[PDB]
């Protein structure tokens, strides 16, 4: 099959990884009490 | 408890002394520009 010309590479740099993990982990630390209730 | 107290007293004194003597050790001169501040 002919290749799709609309493809683009995706990126996540290290700082974005760290920020993202911080957001996820802190949101979890915040919401977990409510999930356990 | 007395050993604990003595220990903490010695520790605190040690660090405080570091602070004072440290700031007494030509601190104005420890900057990038004009060092002669005496």
């Amino acid at each position: 099959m002919e290749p799709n010309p609309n493809r683009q590479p995706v990126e996540l740099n290290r700082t974005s990884l760290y920020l993202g993990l911080l957001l996820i982990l802190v949101l979890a630390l915040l919401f977990s009490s409510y999930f356990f209730n | 408890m007395e050993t604990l107290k003595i220990t903490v007293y010695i520790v605190v004194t040690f660090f405080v002394l570091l602070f004072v003597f440290g700031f007494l050790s030509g601190d104005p001169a420890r900057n990038p520009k004009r060092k002669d501040l005496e």
């Binding site: 915040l30 919401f31 009490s33 409510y34 356990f36 209730n37 | -």
Partner: protein
């Protein structure tokens, strides 16, 4: 170049106060919201809706005046001046709380107007509309708190009234009845506002303390030219300083300023979601495990149970005057009280 385009020409003239197409919505609605608030707080009572004085005319001060919500019996009536309640009578309309809906609705449309203004001017000047986008957070807060929240409740009566002390009351009511501080959406709001304040402070101070000497003055404001091409402070020095002080630092300016948009805007949006829940009494009121333990074990005490005792006090002691339509009579003997107090 017909009438529409001539009008467009005039609307977009570069004058002291820019008008624009959006101005046609914005200026009358903003003017009527402000004017309505001032008229009401200066001259208008809340006797017939709340059993309260609320104007300068009656003896209230800046902190205690308000344009108060209508009686609970009005439900969610638009309370139009020509509506079935006031029936065109301006005085009665004031006595029934007409100014409240007047101010909330003209205010809502004025906010739409203002955000449209932000889009219009950004389009005209050739910038990206991130200011309008940021303004979506004020919109979400106003709509969730003044429109959605009371629409979920019995009536406009339980919306916030427009006054300083009135708003303080709104806060305390939300603590007592909703345990709003316990709500993770409010907590995210707090983090966004306090974090926004922190970023404001730290960014302003950092820029002001990594300035390049661009003049001979000891007062350094004049050593800037809006047209200059150079950064006026050192990002590299700033970055090393915060890297060595705090462990991490911004290194990218664009990211820095986007982040400054992102934190408070997101905070306010989250708080909005929480209030949308409180519209239905869908509260984060309790932790069920806490209550099971405490019910079975009379020695188990945490700050969570302490605060519910406070809430129970607030409800019992404030409800009869705060909710006069309910005709609450709580005999002395049933009022919750600790020892002596």
């Amino acid at each position: 170049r017909g009438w529409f385009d001539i009008l467009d020409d005039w609307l977009k003239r570069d004058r002291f106060v820019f008008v624009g197409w959006s101005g046609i919505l914005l200026f009358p609605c903003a003017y009527l919201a402000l004017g309505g608030w001032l008229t009401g707080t200066t001259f208008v009572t809340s006797w017939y809706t709340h059993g309260l004085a609320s104007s300068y005319l009656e003896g209230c001060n800046f902190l205690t005046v308000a344009v108060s919500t209508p009686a609970n019996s009005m439900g969610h009536s638009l309370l139009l001046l020509w509506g079935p309640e006031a029936q065109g009578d301006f005085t009665r309309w004031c006595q029934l709380g007409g100014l409240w809906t007047f101010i909330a609705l003209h205010g809502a449309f004025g906010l739409i107007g203002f955000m449209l203004r932000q889009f219009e001017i950004a389009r005209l000047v050739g910038v990206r509309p991130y200011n309008a986008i940021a303004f979506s957070a004020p919109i979400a807060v106003f709509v969730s708190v003044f429109l959605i929240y009371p629409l979920g409740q019995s009536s406009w009566f339980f919306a916030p009234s427009f006054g300083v002390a009135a708003i303080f009351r709104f806060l305390l009511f939300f603590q007592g009845f909703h345990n709003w501080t316990l709500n993770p959406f409010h907590m995210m709001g707090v983090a966004g506002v306090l974090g926004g304040a922190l970023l404001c402070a730290i960014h302003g101070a950092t820029v002001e303390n990594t300035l390049f000497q661009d003049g001979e003055g000891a007062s350094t404001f004049r050593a800037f030219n809006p047209t200059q091409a150079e950064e006026t402070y050192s990002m590299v020095t700033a970055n090393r300083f915060w890297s060595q002080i705090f462990g991490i630092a911004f290194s990218n300016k664009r990211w820095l300023h986007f982040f400054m948009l992102f934190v408070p805007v997101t905070g306010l949006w989250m708080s909005a979601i929480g209030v949308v829940g409180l519209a239905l009494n869908l509260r984060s009121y309790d932790f069920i495990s806490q209550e099971i333990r405490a019910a079975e074990d009379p020695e188990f005490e945490t700050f969570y149970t302490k605060n519910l005792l406070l809430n129970e006090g607030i409800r019992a002691w404030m409800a009869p005057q705060d909710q006069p339509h309910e005709n609450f009579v709580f005999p002395e003997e049933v009022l919750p009280r600790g020892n002596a107090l």
